[PDB]
Write an enzyme that holds these catalytic residues in place. Structure first.
Site, PDB file in Angstrom:
ATOM      1  CG  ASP A  15      20.624  42.194  97.413  1.00  7.60           C
ATOM      2  OD1 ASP A  15      20.750  41.298  98.188  1.00  7.60           O
ATOM      3  OD2 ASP A  15      20.824  43.363  97.764  1.00  7.60           O
ATOM      4  CG  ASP A 125      13.485  45.374  99.989  1.00  3.98           C
ATOM      5  OD1 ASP A 125      12.608  45.244  99.381  1.00  3.98           O
ATOM      6  OD2 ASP A 125      14.721  46.005  99.588  1.00  3.98           O
TER       7      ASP A 125
END
Length: 217
Positions: A15, A125
């Site tokens: 991100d 993640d």
């Protein structure tokens, strides 16, 4: 318990946000994780505002995964607030032995450099460029965005060739060593961070000698 252990599940993301463990005062560490400018150059200051909150600091391209050997990879991950406080896990390392997918039986050692606020307790993640920008699209502000689905990211290795170029090697790793595995499960053990991982993040926990020395499994 001082040692994290058990079973979990992995997802994937990138991100572009400044990692949570890149800020001062999160844990007892040698120094926080390095953040980078929009051109992926290392910042010397640890207090630069995150690009995900209107600032100029982003995740470094050299904090991307790589193959160490046929059966072993190193890299970086976000871990949960549910599974413990940032003091307990920032800059810690974990050996994930995969239990599903084409990578079952392979091992990846990840350093936790960031937090996800809605991750499962043992959910990791794993940071992979093109794995999916998710809820916070820092990449839009860094360089105008990444292709791919918001969740799960790009669908073919050849799309890595279109990325901002420093993100290409980590993007390719997803398809090469990782065999495009889809959110594989694992068992895990906390381990002392490999020197090669600390050489990229800069961040070593003060308690790191308390954890097993890692060699090829």
């Amino acid at each position: 318990a001082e040692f994290a252990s058990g079973s979990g599940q992995s997802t994937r993301y990138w991100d572009c946000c400044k990692p949570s463990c890149a800020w001062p005062g999160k844990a007892a560490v040698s120094q926080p994780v390095y953040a980078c400018d929009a051109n992926f150059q290392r910042l010397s200051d640890f207090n630069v505002q995150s690009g995900c909150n209107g600032g100029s600091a982003y995740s470094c391209a050299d904090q991307t995964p790589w193959a160490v050997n046929d059966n072993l990879a190193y890299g970086f991950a976000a871990t949960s607030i549910a599974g413990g406080s940032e003091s307990s896990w920032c800059c810690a390392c974990y050996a994930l032995t995969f239990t599903s997918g084409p990578v079952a039986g392979k091992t990846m050692v990840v350093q936790s450099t960031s937090t996800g606020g809605d991750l499962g307790s043992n959910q990791f993640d794993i940071a992979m460029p093109g794995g999916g920008v998710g809820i916070f699209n820092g990449c839009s502000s860094q360089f105008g965005g990444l292709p791919g689905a918001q969740y799960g990211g790009i669908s073919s290795r050849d799309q890595c060739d279109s990325f901002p170029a420093p993100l290409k090697p980590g993007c390719q790793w997803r398809f090469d060593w990782f065999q495009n595995a889809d959110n594989p499960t694992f068992t895990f053990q906390q381990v002392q961070c490999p020197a090669e991982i600390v050489a990229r993040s800069g961040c070593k926990r003060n308690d790191d000698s308390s954890f097993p020395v890692f060699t090829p499994s």
